[PDB]
């Protein structure tokens, strides 16, 4: 009784992608990032930016016909942090509170079973 999409939230540091697609995933509806909700260049990964992006994405999911959405949360992954950025939870909650129905949340961060050498050098990034 509801039409489902897939939200495909990518919550890194430095940015947050909110990207709804069909079930197949190859048709995209309302990909909005925090970097085009804020103009600060450092607040691009903020929860406020993520919430504004998710509100826009829900607005465009409506009047296109998406009523419910499955959720694929993701971090940068690979050899990088694979900890979700600040904006993932704010985008999730904005999607849930902006009229969209929700189902089947899952974490799809790319995790290596083993990997190329990580960036930074042997002694790491020295601050």
């Amino acid at each position: 009784s509801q039409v489902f999409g897939v939200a495909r939230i990518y919550a890194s540091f430095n940015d947050t992608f909110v990207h709804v697609t069909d079930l197949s995933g190859k048709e995209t509806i309302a990909r909005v990032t925090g970097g085009m909700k804020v103009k600060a260049d450092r607040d691009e990964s903020s929860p406020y930016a993520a919430m504004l992006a998710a509100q826009d994405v829900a607005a465009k999911c409506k009047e296109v016909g998406i009523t419910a959405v499955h959720v694929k949360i993701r971090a940068t992954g690979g050899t990088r942090t694979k900890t979700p950025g600040p904006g993932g939870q704010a985008a999730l909650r904005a999607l849930a509170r902006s009229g969209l129905r929700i189902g089947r949340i899952e974490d799809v961060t790319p995790v290596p079973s083993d990997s190329t050498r990580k960036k930074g050098g042997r002694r790491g990034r020295r601050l």
Partner: protein, 97 residues
Amino acid sequence: PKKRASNGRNKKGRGHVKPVRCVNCSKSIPKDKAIKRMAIRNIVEAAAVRDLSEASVYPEYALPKTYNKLHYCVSCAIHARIVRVRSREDRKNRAPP
């Protein structure tokens, strides 16, 4: 002088282990020495739990968790307050709390 009977690590019997990389700075640290934490968290924050349970299409959803094993070097663990410098006798305690 020698600060620690187990110099800074857990390696008695082998000699070489393998490096891991620090999650914060990517410093190479032997696995036996690295400070290791298991981050098991609900995939949805506690303040958003009610909102997502009300917005769910499933009457009885399970609210999955995320599992992530973090490896810290000594400097990053101390800077991030994961471990703290301890008094001379308190250093000998190995219990987690």
